């Protein structure tokens, strides 16, 4: 036979959470800030 018959070390196999959830960070941040500048925008529009 020439084809025969452990301590795994994770490097980036779990990194997939990053470019999705970490993206969701700036996502909810940006969307939020839009909601805030809209709220204050209407507040200034109440004058």
């Amino acid at each position: 036979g020439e084809c025969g018959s452990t301590s795994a070390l994770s490097l980036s196999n779990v990194a997939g959470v990053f470019y999705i959830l970490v993206g969701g960070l700036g996502l909810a941040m940006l969307v939020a800030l839009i909601e805030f500048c809209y709220k204050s925008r209407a507040e200034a529009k109440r004058m």
């Binding site: 490097l11 980036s12 990194a15 997939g16 990053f18 470019y19 970490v22 993206g23 960070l25 700036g26 941040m29 940006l30 800030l33």
Partner: protein, 175 residues
């Protein structure tokens, strides 16, 4: 006071130019197939001393099951995210020098800080993408690129700090 302008400018030019340097060369220090340098576009060996475009993401010995090297390798290719980050950095400093005159106290400062910080964030994102794509060390300019993103984030902290301080002058003068 003016220290905010100092950290602003030195962070813009420093982190921006350092990011460009990260784009240039020194992306991965390793043994080639043999040793060579890396800049995500071409590799240059130590015969010894030649160069060749190393950005050959597609290789005709694999499985290509379902959008693994297509989505993953294609996304990592052409350095999509970091280019976007650097362009948004030039937009950042552009909104800084534009924010120098033409007061508009709230709009330009806040928007500039937002797009700048988010720009550094996207830079770190592209860093993660390249690290995943690497599937024996890295390049100096790469480390200076990540640290460039860090200092960019600090400059964003000082930026938004100066912004909300300007708001403190706004509501303060309102009283």
């Amino acid at each position: 006071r003016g220290v905010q302008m100092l950290l602003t400018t030195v962070g813009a030019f420093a982190a921006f130019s350092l990011m460009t340097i990260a784009v240039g060369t020194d992306y991965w220090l390793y043994s080639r197939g043999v040793m060579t340098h890396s800049g995500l576009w071409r590799t240059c060996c130590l015969f010894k001393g030649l160069c060749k475009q190393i950005d050959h993401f597609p290789e005709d010995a694999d499985y290509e099951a379902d959008t693994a090297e297509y989505f993953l390798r294609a996304v990592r290719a052409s350095s999509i995210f970091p280019i976007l980050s650097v362009i948004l950095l030039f937009m950042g400093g552009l909104c800084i020098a534009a924010s120098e005159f033409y007061k508009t106290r709230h709009n330009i400062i806040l928007s500039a800080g937002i797009f700048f910080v988010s720009a550094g964030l996207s830079n770190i994102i592209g860093i993660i993408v390249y690290i995943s794509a690497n599937a024996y060390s890295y390049g100096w300019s790469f480390y200076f690129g990540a640290l460039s993103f860090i200092i960019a984030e600090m400059v964003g902290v000082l930026a938004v700090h100066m912004f909300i301080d300007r708001h403190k002058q706004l509501r303060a003068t309102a009283r």
